[PDB]
């Protein structure tokens, strides 16, 4: 009953699903493909970066930005919004490195960014 | 308020034709007790800049923290910022300056004196000074603390002005800095035999020579002196 369940995102539809958050998955589908192979040794990231025209400059633009000195962060979807999630963890990691004097673990970082992206689904 | 607690000694330095030499000793005295030995005060930053810090040990540690964050900051975004927009010596300087002034105003100062020793990408020498008053200046010979009137005179007898930097080679400079550590070591009552030394060249990069001792001391004369004047 009623009308809506897609105007706000701190509604829950009756099925037990969300919206907006359910719709946001289609938005990431419009992006390019980006892979990660977890190796024994490390990780190897790679990203398809489209070249539309020859008007653009080759090897001068990036979807791989560093966070801390030892974490690749590479993203797909809406690119300014993906850069805001990278921006956020540069702040987060620098505070941790100030506070506890060690390079921020990957499992620590994984928790931290997770809480933030969760956090926007609650208002 | 903040007043000194644990304090280093002196970081001393001079320019030469193709780079700069800077050297400091490894000491944290807690007044009378010379309590920390082998705690280093030269901090290499970047790959061509050594930032030599005197005064407070507490404060110094926390400014090493900010330098390390600054390399992390300049690396971000840009892959060409580690090649042609690297952290220059004038950069590492500018941030250290500006931090001192702002802390001076709130009347809780970061009690340090810094020499920021390097060479530009242009090949120019850079040796520039800041202290806790917030005062800046460049000279051809520079020294923190007690060494600014002890060590500084001897160093400054090799390079007097800005036209004897071309004429002073890497081997005369090496000698002068060795010599001035030894001159300090006699007449300065907070010093340590161990000292670290950096040599910044404009073609061989930064070389970081650790754990030198001072030698060739004079004491041979001291068997001759007896009493204070009345006693002979």
- Best residue in A80, A83, A88, A98 for a mutation probing chain B (most B CBs within 10 Å): A98
CB A83 within 8 A of CB A63: no
Q: Measured between alpha carbons, how far is B173 from B175 in angstroms, rounded to an integer?
A: 5
Sheet bearing B49-55, strands edge to edge: B42-45, B49-55, B112-119, B125-130, B136-138
B127 three-state secondary structure? strand
Reading the block at residue B186, the tokens are 């006699």
User: Is B72–A94 a contact, with Cβ atoms under 8 angstroms apart?
Assistant: yes
Strand pairing of B206-213 and B194-201? antiparallel
Reading the block at residue B92, the tokens are 């590492």
Cα B198 off chain centre by: 9
User: Is B72–A62 a contact, with Cβ atoms under 8 angstroms apart?
Assistant: no
Q: Where is B45: in which H helix or E strand? A: strand B42-45
Partner residue facing A65 (CB), from B65, B72, B76: B76
Q: Measured between alpha carbons, how far is B168 from B159 in angstroms, rounded to an integer?
A: 7
Reading the block at residue A121, the tokens are 């689904």
Residues 6+ apart with CB under 8 A from A85: A73, A75, A113, A116, A117
Q: Measured between alpha carbons, how far is B1 from B106 in angstroms, rounded to an integer?
A: 10
Give A90-110 as a 3 state SS string.
HHHHHHHHHHHCCCCCHHHHH
- Min distance A26 CA to chain B CA atoms (Å): 28
Q: Where is B76: in which H helix or E strand? A: none
End-to-end CA distance of chain B: 51
Q: Measured between alpha carbons, how far is B54 from B8 in angstroms, rounded to an integer?
A: 5
- Tell whether A60 lies on the interface with B, counting CB pairs under 8 A: no
User: Is A97–B69 a contact, with Cβ atoms under 8 angstroms apart?
Assistant: yes
CB B31 within 8 A of CB B138: no
CB B207 within 8 A of CB B50: no
Q: Measured between alpha carbons, how far is A94 from A99 in angstroms, rounded to an integer?
A: 9
CB B25 within 8 A of CB B194: yes
Partner residue facing A90 (CB), from B65, B76, B79: B76
Q: Measured between alpha carbons, how far is B48 from B199 in angstroms, rounded to an integer?
A: 10
Q: Measured between alpha carbons, how far is B217 from B186 in angstroms, rounded to an integer?
A: 8
Q: Measured between alpha carbons, how far is A72 from A74 in angstroms, rounded to an integer?
A: 6
How many CB atoms within 10 Å of residue B193? 14
Chain A's closest residue to B76, CA to CA, is A66
CB B54 within 8 A of CB B24: yes
Reading the block at residue A71, the tokens are 């974490």
Q: Measured between alpha carbons, how far is B129 from A46 in angstroms, rounded to an integer?
A: 45
Partner residue facing A94 (CB), from B69, B75, B79: B69
Contacts for A94-98: CB closer than 8 Å, 24+ residues apart: A94/B69, A94/B72, A97/A68, A97/B69, A98/B65, A98/B69
Reading the block at residue A66, the tokens are 């560093």
What phi and psi values does residue A4 have, to the nearest 5 degrees? 130, -135
B25 three-state secondary structure? strand
Give A31-89 as a 3 state SS string.
CCCEEEEECCCCEEEEECCCCCCCCCCCCCCCCEEEECCCEEEECCCCHHHHHHHHHHH
Cα A87 off chain centre by: 10
B84 three-state secondary structure? coil
Q: Which residue has the tokens 């330098």?
A: B67
Reading the block at residue B183, the tokens are 């001159």
- If phi > 0 it is left, if psi is from -120 to 50 it is alpha, else beta; for residue B99 that is alpha
Reading the block at residue B109, the tokens are 């100062």
CB B112 within 8 A of CB B56: yes
């Amino acid at each position: 009953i009623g009308t809506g369940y897609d105007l706000s995102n701190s509604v829950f539809s009756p099925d037990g699903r969300n919206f907006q958050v359910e719709y946001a998955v289609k938005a990431v589908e419009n992006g390019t493909t980006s892979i990660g192979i977890k190796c024994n040794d490390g990780v190897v990231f790679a990203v398809e970066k489209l070249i539309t025209s020859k008007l653009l400059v080759p090897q001068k633009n990036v979807k791989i930005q560093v966070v801390d000195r030892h974490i690749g962060c590479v993203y797909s979807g809406l690119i300014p919004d993906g850069r805001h999630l990278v921006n956020r963890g540069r702040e987060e990691a620098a505070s941790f490195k100030k506070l506890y004097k060690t390079p921020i673990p990957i499992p620590a970082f994984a928790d931290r960014l997770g809480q933030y992206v969760q956090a926007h689904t609650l208002y | 308020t903040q007043q000194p607690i644990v304090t280093g000694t002196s970081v001393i330095s001079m320019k030469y034709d193709n780079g700069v030499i800077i050297a400091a000793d490894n000491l944290g005295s807690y007044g009378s007790l010379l309590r920390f030995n082998g705690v280093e005060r030269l901090i290499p930053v970047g790959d061509n800049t050594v930032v030599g810090i005197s005064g407070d040990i507490s404060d110094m540690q926390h400014i090493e923290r900010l330098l390390k964050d600054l390399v992390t900051e300049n690396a971000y975004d840009n892959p060409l910022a580690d090649a042609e927009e690297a952290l220059e010596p004038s950069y590492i300087f500018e941030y250290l300056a500006t931090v001192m002034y702002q802390r001076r105003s709130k009347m809780n100062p970061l009690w340090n004196a810094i020499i920021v020793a390097g060479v530009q990408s242009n090949g120019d020498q850079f040796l520039r000074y800041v202290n806790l008053l917030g005062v800046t200046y460049s000279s051809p010979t520079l020294a923190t603390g007690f060494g600014a009137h002890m060590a500084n005179p001897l160093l400054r007898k090799v390079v007097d002005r800005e036209s004897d930097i071309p004429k002073t080679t890497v081997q005369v400079a090496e000698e002068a800095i060795v010599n001035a550590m030894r001159v300090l070591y006699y007449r300065d009552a907070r010093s340590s035999r161990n000292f670290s030394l950096a040599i910044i060249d404009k073609n061989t990069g930064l070389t970081f020579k650790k754990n030198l001792q001072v030698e060739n001391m004079k004491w041979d004369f001291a068997k001759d002196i007896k009493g204070y004047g009345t006693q002979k």
